[PDB]
């Protein structure tokens, strides 16, 4: 919703057991809403004391490992589980199938505020790094890099460049820092135009079928494969309204009785993983919240991408 | 009903060793036991367009653009040293015998009938015309394939190595004994009876064959050429690879055996070409055609099936061709 | 459990049984003729259908391989320059007059072979139609690669009757031609039980051997041989 | 573009290897590409090879990769006769210009 | 019906050996038997940036950073010893014959028609003009390519070896025999008659050709340049290597053969430049322009097809060119 005055690079963060089930329809890399919520929790915890705002997160995902296995005779996969403790009668409890993933991601954070002029860049960078080293990113603990060879501090780069060439060199150096990974971006325009292409191909086609067609490998008879522009993952694109926004004390057993609750349904969109050298600026990769609370639509996206 | 056996594999008689190439000088061939071997070296070739264009590369601009991108290659080359004009080729030939007996035969009764057919052949005429023609191919250096088309003088020495020592020596002139005529000579007849005793089963025959060719000082000698995997870059393409055994150029053994096999003159086509190799359906790779077609009923299989199954014995020339194929050997019978 | 006869293939399980993990299993082997193919241990619980579809991959692979192995030759009708190919015909047997050839401006049409060593003949269009009529390959001619030369000869003295396996290539079930036993009976003009007799091999019982004319007319109707 | 991206990605995981693997003994180890294969050997050698990558500024290696990318094109004379080869060479030159510019400022 | 054969592989005639290079002094050439061979050596070069820039390297500071880092190579150079102003180059040439007979062919009817066409050509006008032009290309040191360009005096000796001993010696003067004029000389007619006897199959011809060029004391000679795989570093990049056999710099045999093939003065463009090489589509790689374009119908393939199939015999110089292409050999036919 705003252009960041600076970009803070949180380095390689090893998230231990992240929620591999991103959505009721998708598994794998966690939701971008988890990353945006983590950055908002960082702004809630240490952002206010530094007189800065932390909005917008760019994910690089340097490493992914899924705690999964492939059973023999099946082409699908299953989630490795954890043994929950027994009940009070000594019996095994009912198992809820929860999957885990070891992530290694680096985050670009959009920083704007007067506190950037009040503190050194390395000071606020080290403060938000040591705050983020005791938090969670998708349900997993963050490994804070103890007793390895060379630890990685941040590099907060001011986006108000004095010259266009110096700004370009700064963005290329920051892209070179986060090199072995893929920027995950939102593709609402690509999914909508593919929906229009399928509607010209066949009418009454929903956005779900256009999302599904952009993920399966289509085999065409003369036997070739229908190509895709990018990786084109199905991402959770936010939450849509399923109920009116009830009063803060209205909903029974809410998390807090001061925040209003509204039952939601998952919104599914198309995301794309790209090499981060294929972007004009690294501020395009930032994932922003977008509530629009009168109509539900509690989305996260990448505005100012293309 | 005495049908043909489904499996009729035959072992080859007249097994040649790999023909090692060395380099040397004329009149030193009586002491050519220390001669340095011909080494397969490398040289770079730059080429322009010299093939037929398929009516789309015939435009002047496209042809000139193809000229400005020459095809650079590296070729394995075999040349004599500048003080060496003589190319020496040495191989051993082992004559086994028992050409009637197949290595594999499904039908006993067919095996007995084929053995009786070969026995009645040998009782009619032994391994004498075939051994004479094989001895003629020994005497001329037909195993020197392209190292004889421009050779000034070729000489072949054949030794009978009985107990690791020369039991009988023969020296020949490979240019006087041509590649066309199967004449008669006393030393050629003695080598014919030696190959006859080898092929019948009278004794063990091992022949050491040494060849000397007056090509020229530093000229290119032609070994057998290998097969190219075609994996590297187009600059160092390695279009041609020659055959060597231990840092030493050589001819393939089956090439020597095919050149010794070149005795078949009884094919139904004319004698304008001369002898061809004794193949089933009389195939010649250079001419790209098959003498002794199955349509003209003079291939090996029709002649053998008439000779064995229904006792229709062919002419003695076709009997020689059939027994020469049995000496040559192969996977006969239906797969 | 027992062998599943799919095409010429037999999925023969092993008589002995094992219990990998906590489940029973069986060594199932895919036989093409007297030759085994791909072998996989199938759990006893697996259905016969599961077994078949499981090996279906190997089955399909073999069929594809065979088709490629015996793909018929193809002659090109080209112009005087020879670079442009106006027509392509899948030949059954190459003509008996073509030789090392390249199209010449003299003749408007030339027939050549698909291989590099282009052997051919300069023919007009009516002679091209005559050659295409007498030497065309039928659509399922690749199965003639899998059959021996004795069962495909047009001479009765050299003709050998097909066995149960050689007939079982192309009669029923998941065959290479895809036809059924009743369809192959209706092609030959007789009822299902008598055609089944020919199809049936094993002992002399129901081993009525198919005749030379009936086998060649069946090959004509299935588009495998002589179907121009 | 995706292919040269993966080349950078390959170099990216070459940042995860040993600091001095390029200084090991060998008869042939692609020493023309070794200035970009191992950027960390400038930490290993103070002046033996640290100044070599700075003075040389190796950006021609992608041209070698372009030669490998010239093995990714079809051997069709119809493309070479028409302007399809011209468009292929234009987009190849633009993308390896971007690749060489990426490889130029590796010293920062 | 007489179509052109799909394969028409021809063995090359005028087979040259690899031309070894040694160095010495002038008028010691008669004692040039044990001259020290030219050895390929290494020398280091650093260079300024001197190619044409593409309008983006033309900035002053960026070009300044370019010249501040000169490029480094190690080039193989071939230099004479300082007590040597004369370069000696030795090779042998084999004249085979049977120029119209292909080594590999498909159609026997087309092969017989091509053989009859070549025999008809030999019948009216035998191998005399082509052999005279090849004698001229032996007479001038055209195989000293950049290697007689700045020579004060060039001399060529062509000896004829019969039984290991010299038969006819042909001492020449390559300054008199020009690189453009195909005149007549009695010794050149004698060498033409010898190459005529070799090309017609009358006898075996092996010629030892030695060229002495007076370049300068310790100057640069120009052997054949090889191909570099570029597997080294960038400082010692090894940008240039020169060809040698055994510690002795030399010229490639195909370079000598292309020098002897430069007899083609009958290309449809202007011949004031001089002779070009015998080749299909008349393609010289220095000019980058093909004379005898297939548009003008003066190339080898159109003339050969018109001569053999349609029996349209071309101009006499053009059939000289066609038979010279058959002498040089090729992979004519479909490619």
UniProtKB/Swiss-Prot annotation, chain D:
Disruption phenotype: Mutants lose phage DMS3 infection-dependent inhibition of biofilm formation while there is normal biofilm formation in the absence of phage infection. Decreased production of crRNA in the presence or absence of phage. Disruption of the entire Y.pestis-subtype CRISPR region disrupts crRNA production but does not alter phage resistance (possibly OLNs PA14_33350 to PA14_33310, and the flanking CRISPR loci), indicating this CRISPR is not involved in phage resistance. CRISPR (clustered regularly interspaced short palindromic repeat) is an adaptive immune system that provides protection against mobile genetic elements (viruses, transposable elements and conjugative plasmids). CRISPR clusters contain sequences complementary to antecedent mobile elements and target invading nucleic acids. CRISPR clusters are transcribed and processed into CRISPR RNA (crRNA). Cas3 and Cascade participate in CRISPR interference, the third stage of CRISPR immunity (Potential). Involved in crRNA production or stability. Interacts directly with Csy2; part of the Csy ribonucleoprotein complex with a probable stoichiometry of Csy1(1),Csy2(1),Csy3(6),Cas6/Csy4(1)-crRNA(1). A Csy3(6),Cas6/Csy4(1)-crRNA(1) subcomplex is also formed. In this bacteria, Y.pestis-subtype CRISPRs do not confer resistance to phage DMS3 or MP22, but instead are required for DMS3 infection-dependent inhibition of biofilm formation and possibly motility. Belongs to the CRISPR-associated Csy1 family. This is CRISPR-associated protein Csy1. It comes from Pseudomonas aeruginosa (strain UCBPP-PA14). The chain holds residues 327 to 434 of 434 of the full protein.
């Amino acid at each position: 919703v705003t252009d960041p005055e600076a970009l803070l690079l949180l380095p390689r963060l090893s998230i231990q057991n992240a929620n591999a089930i991103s959505s009721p329809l998708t598994w794998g890399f966690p939701s971008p809403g988890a990353f945006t919520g983590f950055v908002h929790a960082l702004q809630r915890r240490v952002g206010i004391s530094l007189d800065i705002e932390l909005d917008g997160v760019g994910i690089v995902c340097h490493r992914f490992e899924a705690q999964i296995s492939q059973p023999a005779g099946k082409r699908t996969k299953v989630f490795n589980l954890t043994r929950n403790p027994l009940n009070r009668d000594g019996s095994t409890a009912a198992i809820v199938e929860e999957g885990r993933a070891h992530l290694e991601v680096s985050l670009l954070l959009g920083v704007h505020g007067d506190g950037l002029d009040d503190h050194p860049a390395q000071e606020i960078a080290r403060q938000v790094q040591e705050q983020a080293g005791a938090m969670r990113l998708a349900g997993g603990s963050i490994l804070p890099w103890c007793n390895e060879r060379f630890p990685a501090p941040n590099a907060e780069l001011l986006m108000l460049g004095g010259s266009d060439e110096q700004r370009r060199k700064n963005q290329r150096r920051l892209t070179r820092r986060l090199l072995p990974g893929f920027a995950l971006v939102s593709r609402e325009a690509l999914l909508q135009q593919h929906l229009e292409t399928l509607r010209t191909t066949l009418p009454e086609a929903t956005t779900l079928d256009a999302l599904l067609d952009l993920c399966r490998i289509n085999f065409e008879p003369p036997w070739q494969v229908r190509d895709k522009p990018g990786w084109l993952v199905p991402i959770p694109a936010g939450y849509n309204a399923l109920s009116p926004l009830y009063l803060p004390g209205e909903v029974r057993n809410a998390r807090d009785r001061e925040t209003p609750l509204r039952f939601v349904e998952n919104l599914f969109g198309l995301g794309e993983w790209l090499s981060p050298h294929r972007v004009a600026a690294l501020s395009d990769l930032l994932w922003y919240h977008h509530a629009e609370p009168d109509k539900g639509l509690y989305r996260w996206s990448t505005p100012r991408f293309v | 009903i005495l049908s043909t056996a489904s499996v009729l594999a035959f072992e080859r008689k007249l097994d040649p060793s790999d023909a090692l190439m060395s380099a040397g000088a004329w009149a030193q061939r009586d002491a050519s036991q220390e001669w340095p071997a011909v080494t397969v070296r490398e040289k770079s070739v730059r080429g322009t367009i010299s093939n037929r264009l398929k009516t789309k590369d015939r435009d002047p601009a496209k042809l000139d653009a193809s000229i400005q991108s020459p095809n650079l290659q590296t070729v394995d080359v075999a040349n004599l040293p500048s003080d060496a004009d003589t190319l020496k080729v040495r191989f051993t030939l082992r004559v086994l015998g028992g050409a009637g007996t197949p290595s594999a035969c499904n039908d006993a009764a067919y095996r007995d009938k084929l053995l009786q057919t070969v026995a009645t052949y040998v009782n009619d005429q032994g391994f004498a015309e075939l051994a004479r023609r094989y001895a003629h191919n020994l005497a001329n250096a037909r195993f020197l394939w392209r190292n004889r088309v421009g050779a000034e003088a070729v000489e072949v020495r054949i030794n009978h190595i009985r107990q690791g020592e020369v039991a009988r020596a023969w020296r020949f002139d490979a240019l006087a004994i041509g590649l066309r005529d199967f004449k008669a000579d006393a030393e050629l007849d003695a080598l014919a009876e030696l190959i006859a005793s080898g092929l019948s089963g009278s004794g063990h025959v091992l022949l050491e064959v040494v060849a000397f060719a007056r090509i020229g000082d530093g000229q290119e000698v032609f070994p057998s050429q290998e097969l190219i995997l075609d994996k590297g870059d187009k600059k160092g393409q390695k279009s041609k690879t020659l055959y060597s055994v231990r840092d030493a150029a050589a001819i393939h053994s089956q090439k020597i055996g095919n050149a010794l096999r070149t005795i078949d003159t009884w094919y139904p086509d004319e004698d304008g070409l001369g002898p061809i190799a004794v193949e089933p359906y009389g195939s010649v790779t250079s001419q790209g055609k098959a003498y002794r077609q199955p349509k003209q009923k003079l291939d090996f299989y029709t002649l053998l099936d008439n000779w064995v199954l229904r006792d229709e014995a062919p002419a003695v020339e076709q009997q020689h061709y059939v027994i020469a194929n049995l000496i040559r050997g192969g996977v006969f019978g239906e797969a | 459990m027992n062998a599943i006869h799919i095409g010429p293939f037999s999925i023969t399980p092993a008589a002995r049984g094992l219990h990998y993990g906590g489940l029973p299993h069986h060594q199932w082997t895919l036989y093409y003729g007297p030759r085994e193919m791909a072998i996989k241990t199938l759990p006893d619980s697996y259905t016969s259908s599961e077994v078949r579809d499981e090996f279906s991959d190997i089955i399909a692979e073999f069929v594809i391989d065979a088709r490629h192995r015996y793909a018929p030759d193809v002659l090109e009708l080209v112009n005087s320059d020879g670079d442009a190919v106006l027509a392509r015909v899948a030949v059954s047997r190459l003509p008996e007059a073509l030789s090392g050839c390249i199209p010449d401006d003299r003749f408007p049409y030339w027939l050549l072979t698909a291989s590099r060593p282009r052997l051919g003949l300069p023919v007009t269009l009516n002679e091209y139609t005559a050659l295409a009529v007498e030497l065309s390959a039928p659509p399922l001619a690749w199965i003639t690669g899998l059959l021996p030369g004795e069962v495909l000869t047009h001479d009765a003295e050299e003709w050998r009757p097909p066995t149960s396996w050689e007939l079982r290539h192309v009669v029923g079930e998941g065959s290479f031609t895809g036809v059924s036993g009743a369809a192959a009976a209706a092609l030959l003009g007789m009822s299902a039980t008598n055609f089944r007799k020919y199809t049936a091999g094993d002992s002399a019982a129901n081993r009525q051997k198919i005749s030379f004319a009936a086998w060649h007319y069946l090959l004509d109707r299935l588009g495998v041989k002589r179907a121009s | 573009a995706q292919i040269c991206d993966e080349a950078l990605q390959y170099a990216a995981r070459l940042r995860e290897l040993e600091p001095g693997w390029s200084a090991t003994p060998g008869c042939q180890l692609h020493d023309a590409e070794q200035l970009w294969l191992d950027p960390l050997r400038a930490q290993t050698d103070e002046t033996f090879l640290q100044r070599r990558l700075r003075g040389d500024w190796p950006a021609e290696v992608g041209n070698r990769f372009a030669n490998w990318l010239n093995r990714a094109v079809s051997s069709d004379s119809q493309i070479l006769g028409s302007p399809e080869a011209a468009q292929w060479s234009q987009e190849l030159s633009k993308e390896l210009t971007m690749f060489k510019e990426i490889l130029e400022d590796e010293r920062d």
